[PDB]
Design a protein around this nucleic acid. Structure first.
Lengths: 215, 228
RNA sequence: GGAAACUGGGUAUAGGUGAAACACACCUGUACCACCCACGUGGUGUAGUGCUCCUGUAUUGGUACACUUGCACGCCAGUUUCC
């Protein structure tokens, strides 16, 4: 069979100075052929622990690894800011090798209501037969938010993508760009384009909106 | 560092295609260590792919690439290879190259990693982005809280690099992860928050470079016309 | 090539070591099996010589001629050094 590596939690929200533990359970025995990696955005992984619990050179000593049978736990004795990242786990007991799916680690803060901004399409773009309507949710935390597009109070669906920033380095917040894509032909057929946002910092949902062809 | 791994030759490949990756080593000889390929699709986790064991030549493959890939090495040129055949978009990932340590010091851990090179499996044509202004609101705020950006749409492959006033502007800037839209082209936007008091004078320019197609664009980003 | 050290029946298998997951090399165990004996908690390259020891064939105690046990060289094969 292929050995499975099952790594809880797959993300984790903690503060500087907390003890933390990522766990990685094995479908079969791997003796001690476990290794733990740390990866940061845009960057290769870096080794942290090799075999059971041995600490690859230069890695700080707040990093430890342990073992009970087929269950392995990376541990950080108190988080430092340079430690928030994703962490993987590998077995190399036998081929094919197997990586855990990672545990992203993120910084707990208090709730930040988003600042909501809506952008119509450029008239330059409308020269190309397409409209794009952009909605900005700015410096919010926690990460979960709701973005519904109502067009002449008709709720939309499946004509809009989105993406989220990584947690901000300074104030540890998130931001989001939702993009409604229309055809110019359909875009021009309607007036009130709106963006309605639900979040924990919002006592009631926030609508930013405009009218197609006002100033 | 002295020890380095440098992948090359990943790029754009249409499905059913054939790329070959090179991992070239410096500061150590690959013939005394085991060399590994490990891929990572965007936003996804890591995936061991294949490896090659020293002195034996013994190769090993993850079940998801069995039959399509081949890992090989060249001592004369201190380079590992990864021949890829029968490619498909599922295979779109950054393809890192790594090395197992020495048993006495780092067990079987992977202590040295290339940069990763990017394979994009897609039938899309290399294409330059189009950049459109996200203008500040006419209402904005009477106090200085305003928001603007650029929309960078329909380019291929990844990546782009966006800057504001050629690096001058960094504070309050978010450039969001690109989104692969159903046409197979990418699109992302970049924003920044600036004082509303600054709009009437300060000229904001986003700097867009899409390297894969030799494309730099700058858009001045003004307040909406008739917004006085 | 020169000399320097070791090593020695078969198949498996566990562990170690060699820049070493497998392979290859080496080292150490284990199990089993094939053979020698004088039959063991035994032994194990060798149709060689010498001493030895066991068992015979007997002949002219002596002597041959075998068989066996051990020891020492030699020879053979492998390994590791060092020029």
């Amino acid at each position: 069979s292929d050995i499975q590596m099952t790594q809880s939690p797959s993300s984790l929200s903690a503060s500087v100075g907390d003890r933390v533990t990522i766990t990685c359970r094995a479908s079969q025995s791997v003796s001690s052929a476990v290794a733990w990696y740390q990866q940061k955005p845009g960057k290769a992984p870096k080794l942290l622990i090799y075999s059971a619990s041995s600490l690859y050179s230069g890695v700080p000593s707040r990093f430890s690894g342990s073992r009970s049978g087929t269950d392995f736990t990376l541990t950080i004795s108190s988080l430092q800011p340079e430690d928030f990242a994703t962490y993987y786990c590998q077995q190399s007991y036998s081929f094919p090798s197997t990586f855990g799916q990672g545990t992203k680690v993120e910084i707990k803060r208090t709730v930040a209501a988003p600042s909501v901004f809506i952008f119509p399409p450029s008239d330059e773009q409308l020269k190309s037969g397409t409209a794009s309507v952009v909605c900005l949710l700015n410096n919010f935390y926690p990460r979960e938010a709701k973005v519904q597009w109502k067009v002449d109070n008709a709720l939309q669906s499946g004509n809009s993508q989105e993406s989220v920033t990584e947690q901000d380095s300074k104030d540890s917040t998130y931001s989001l760009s939702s993009t409604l894509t229309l055809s110019k032909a359909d875009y021009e057929k309607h007036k009130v384009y709106a963006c309605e946002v639900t979040h924990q910092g919002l006592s009631s949902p926030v609508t930013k909106s405009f009218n197609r062809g006002e100033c | 560092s002295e020890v380095q791994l440098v992948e090359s030759g990943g790029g754009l490949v249409q499905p059913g295609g054939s790329l070959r990756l090179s991992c070239a080593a410096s500061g150590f000889y690959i013939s005394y260590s085991s060399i590994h390929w490990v891929r990572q699709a965007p936003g996804k986790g890591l995936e061991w792919v294949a490896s090659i064991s020293p002195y034996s030549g013994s190769t090993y493959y993850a079940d998801s690439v069995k039959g399509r890939f081949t890992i090989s090495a060249d001592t004369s040129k201190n380079t590992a290879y990864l021949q890829m055949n029968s490619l498909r978009a599922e295979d779109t990932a950054v393809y890192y190259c790594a090395r197992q340590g020495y048993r006495r010091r780092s067990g079987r851990g992977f202590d040295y990693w290339g940069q990763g090179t990017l394979v994009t499996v897609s039938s899309a044509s290399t294409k330059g982005p189009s950049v459109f202004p996200l203008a500040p609101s006419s209402k904005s705020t009477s106090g200085g809280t305003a928001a603007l950006g650029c929309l960078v749409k329909d380019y291929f492959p990844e990546p782009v690099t966006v800057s504001w006033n050629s690096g001058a502007l960094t504070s309050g800037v978010h450039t969001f992860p690109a989104v692969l839209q159903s046409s197979g082209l990418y699109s992302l936007s970049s924003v920044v928050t600036v004082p509303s008091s600054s709009l009437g004078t300060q000229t904001y320019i986003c700097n867009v470079n899409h390297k894969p197609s030799n494309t730099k664009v700058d858009k001045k980003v003004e307040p909406k016309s008739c917004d006085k």
